[PDB]
């Protein structure tokens, strides 16, 4: 573990995310992420919005705390996810859940620093589709992102929370549409 208050910390977090999720998100997603990272550094050369970078660093440095808190809330609100026959019953499966939780948070942070939902439109939506192709329609999944949102915004003030909430809402709405319109 390591946390810093520097733009290089966010850059390294994005690189690690790209490296870890490259095989899962596909080649088009990695190209988008690489282009995003290059543009962020190019615009950082001309100065960066400190408020956005502050909220991004605050969410990145507490990534694992947010993941654990959200996962605990989700298991409590839907114990069937970790019970026999559930999607997160297996140790590997539960580990994959926490992985995707951290990746959702990385995507949120990418939108934060960019002030745009682009990274969620391109990468996020596609992955939400692939993820449902491997998991199926599990109703408890709808609370998954809510817990993450509840666990992320709980570390921010009302202004920072208001700046970050729209991306969680966009993700929840997208998953809802994918969930109830998959087999159609």
Ligand X SMILES: C=CC1=C(C)C(Cc2[nH]c(Cc3[nH]c(CC4=NC(=O)[C@H](C)[C@H]4C=C)c(C)c3CCC(=O)O)c(CCC(=O)O)c2C)=NC1=O
Structure-block tokens of residue 161: 């929370």
Residue 87 interacting with Na ion (CB under 5 A): yes
Nearer to ligand X, 142 or 155 (CB): 142
Range 23-42, binding ligand X (CB under 6 A): 24-25
Count the site residues for ligand X by CB under 6 A.
21
Segment contacting ligand X (CB under 6 A): 1-9, 50-58, 96-104, 150-158?
96-104
C-alpha span between 99 and 118 (Å, rounded):
21
Range 137-166, binding ligand X (CB under 6 A): 141, 144
**Long-range Cβ pairs for the range 17-23 (8 Å, 24+):** 17/103, 17/106, 20/99, 20/103, 21/103
* CB of residue 45 to ligand X, shortest distance in Å: 27
Partner in contact with 68, chosen from ligand X, Na ion, none, beta carbon below 5 to 8 Å by kind:
none
Helical (H) or strand (E) element with 38: helix 27-44
**Displacement of CA 117 from its chain's centroid (Å):** 12
By the 8 A CB rule, do 155 and 108 touch?
Answer: no
C-alpha span between 123 and 82 (Å, rounded):
27
Site string for Na ion, 89-108 (x = CB under 5 A): xx--x---------------
Partner in contact with 24, chosen from ligand X, Na ion, none, beta carbon below 5 to 8 Å by kind:
ligand X
The binding site for Na ion (CB under 5 A) comprises 80, 86-87, 89-90, 93, 138
């Amino acid at each position: 573990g390591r946390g810093s208050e520097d733009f290089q910390y966010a850059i390294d977090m994005f690189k690690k995310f790209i490296e870890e999720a490259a095989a899962s998100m596909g080649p088009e997603a990695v190209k988008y992420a690489k282009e995003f990272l290059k543009l962020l550094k190019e615009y950082h050369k001309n100065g960066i919005n400190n408020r956005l970078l502050k909220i991004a660093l605050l969410l990145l440095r507490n990534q694992k705390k947010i993941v654990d808190k959200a996962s605990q809330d989700l298991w409590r609100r839907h114990p069937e996810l970790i019970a026999p026959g559930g999607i997160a019953f297996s140790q590997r499966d539960r580990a994959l859940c926490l992985r995707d939780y951290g990746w959702f948070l990385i995507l949120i942070v990418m939108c934060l620093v960019s002030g745009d939902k682009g990274p969620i439109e391109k990468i996020g939506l596609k992955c939400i589709r692939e993820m449902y192709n491997s998991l199926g329609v599990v109703p408890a999944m709808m609370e998954s992102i809510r817990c993450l949102k509840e666990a992320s915004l709980s570390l921010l003030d009302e202004e920072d929370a208001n700046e970050t909430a729209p991306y969680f809402d966009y993700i929840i709405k997208a998953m809802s549409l994918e969930h109830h319109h998959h087999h159609h």
